Amino acid sequence: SVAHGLAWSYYIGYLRLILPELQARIRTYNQHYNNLLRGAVSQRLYILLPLDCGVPDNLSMADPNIRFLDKLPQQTGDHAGIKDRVYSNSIYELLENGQRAGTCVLEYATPLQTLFAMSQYSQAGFSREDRLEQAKLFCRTLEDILADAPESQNNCRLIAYQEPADDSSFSLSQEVLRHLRQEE
């Protein structure tokens, strides 16, 4: 299936490459680049899995209570004949009642944008119904892989979520914080 392929691609070409080095990058940040006066960046990559595959490029905007602080130091490697391919991750602050309640490495799972685009382009032959189904299958497949992965499950948290189309005003920062605080 499409989701099976994207989930393995996301593991093989990214997660298994970055997650075993992520701890050291975050420690290195917290010791040398982090504001002296602020809380340490939490450990683990937090991965946002919107099942409707709505993935903005600006996470900082879009949500008032989630703001970009800084980048982790880059990770570089040679991959597929590209010298020094760069993998970068961004640090965000999470707000609760107008003040910082948490700080973490946070991003959307990029392959969900692929499922979104594919539902948009006619040549892909991929419907909006297929997209939801493939989204859930992506997340499941990804959870199964991470469950027996050495490149651990324990350096990331998957945050899957649905926003109501019946409109009950969803809170993304509270979702992260919920996951963040399970780790405290």
Ligand X SMILES: Nc1nc(=O)c2ncn([C@@H]3O[C@@H]4COP(=O)(O)O[C@H]5[C@@H](O)[C@H](n6cnc7c(N)ncnc76)O[C@@H]5COP(=O)(O)O[C@@H]3[C@@H]4O)c2[nH]1
Per 3-state DSSP, what percentage of the chain is helix, strand, and coil (rounded to 5)? 40, 25, 35
Radius of gyration of the CA atoms of the chain, in A: 17
To 5 degrees, how large is the angle CA 153–CA 154–CA 160?
Answer: 60
List all residues 6 or more positions away from 49 whose beta carbon is below 8 Å from its beta carbon: 108, 109, 112, 135, 138, 139, 158, 159, 160, 161
Residue 55 contacts which entry, ligand X, its own copies, none (Cβ below 5-8 A, type-dependent): its own copies
- Residue with Cβ nearer its own copies (78 or 129): 78
Residue 14 contacts which entry, ligand X, its own copies, none (Cβ below 5-8 A, type-dependent): ligand X
The tokens of 55 are what? 């993935």
Of 5-13, 20-28, 158-166, 175-183, which segment contacts its own copies by CB under 8 A?
Answer: 5-13
Q: Is 108 in the site for its own copies (CB under 8 A)?
A: yes
To its own copies, the closest distance from the beta carbon of 22 in angstroms equals: 14
Cβ neighbours, 10 Å, residue 165: 7
The tokens of 158 are what? 């998957």
Binding mask 62-81 for its own copies (x = CB under 8 A): ------x--x--x--xxxxx
- List Cα–Cα distances, 83 to 74, 80, 86, 102, in angstroms: 14, 8, 9, 36
Size of the site for ligand X (CB under 6 A): 13
On the CB side of 55, CA atoms within 13 Å amount to 20
Residue 74 contacts which entry, ligand X, its own copies, none (Cβ below 5-8 A, type-dependent): its own copies
Which residues line the annotated binding site for 2',3'-cGAMP?
Answer: 9, 14, 85, 110
Q: Which residues of the shown chain bind ligand X in the complex (CB under 6 A)?
A: 6, 9-10, 13-14, 80, 82, 85, 87, 107, 110-111, 114
Q: Which residues of the shown chain bind its own copies in the complex (CB under 8 A)?
A: 1-6, 8-9, 12-13, 48, 55-60, 68, 71, 74, 77-86, 88-90, 92, 106-111, 113-114, 117-118, 121, 123-124, 144-145, 148
